[PDB]
């Protein structure tokens with residue numbers, strides 16, 4: 001199980017937001033903590049991504065672009081999983097020190113998105129997603145959004161994405177001699193992975209609007225995040241960069 005050994009081995013550990021939970025909730029503080037948390041997780045997403053099998057094959061510019069585009073979705077997916085395993089989807093486990101109840105979902109002004117992620121969290125349970133299916137599905141997510149104009153080395157990207165799909169097939173076939181059983185599972189999983197995109201889109205849109213009026217709501221946007229939101233996110237919202245759906 002070389003491939004899964006690698007995925008387990010590089011899976012980021014716990015990342016805290018540094019939020020002050022002794023302070024009454026507020027939009028400004030919850031959002032600054034979400035911004036800071038997002039940035040902290042990005043540090044790990046980059047280290048994770050670069051240690052992924054075959055990733056280094058991608059052109060240097062493609063590696064960075066793909067990480068930045070996939071950044072939101074990857075966080076959404078892992079957060080839903082953490083929410084499921086830690087609190088049985090009762091709340092959204094953004095981080096040990098940043099857990100959202102409905103009140104916080106409402107106060108963050110990201111209520112519709114949070115509810116959608118809570119449903120995703122429940123999906124992990126309802127579909128009985130295994131830790132290994134999760135790990136492989138997450139790696140696949142990193143290769144699920146590309147520019148219409150194409151990457152520097154599109155062929156390398158396609159090969160890599162195809163190999164990751166092949167690994168998902170193997171994890172699914174492992175202990176399923178019934179083809180019909182494998183097919184239904186692949187259907188369920190690709191359906192779950194597609195559901196992540198629309199959620200990341202609503203968060204992208206929300207964050208973009210927020211950045212534009214950040215000075216009007218007292219939100220502190222970190223350096224790297226502001227740059228990525230103003231350079232990369234606009235490409236997604238305008239349709240120049242699109243997610244790869246299965247269905």
Ligand SMILES: C[C@](O)(COc1ccc(Cl)c(F)c1)C(=O)Nc1ccc(C#N)c(C(F)(F)F)c1
Pocket residue numbers: 031033034035036037038039041068071072074075076077078079093094203204207208228229233
């Ligand atoms: C608003 C924000 O602070 C920043 O989100 C962005 C992150 C990346 C990009 Cl490309 C963006 F446009 C916004 C945020 O959503 N942070 C955030 C931090 C951690 C997690 C986790 N886990 C999440 C997520 F994915 F659950 F929604 C979100």
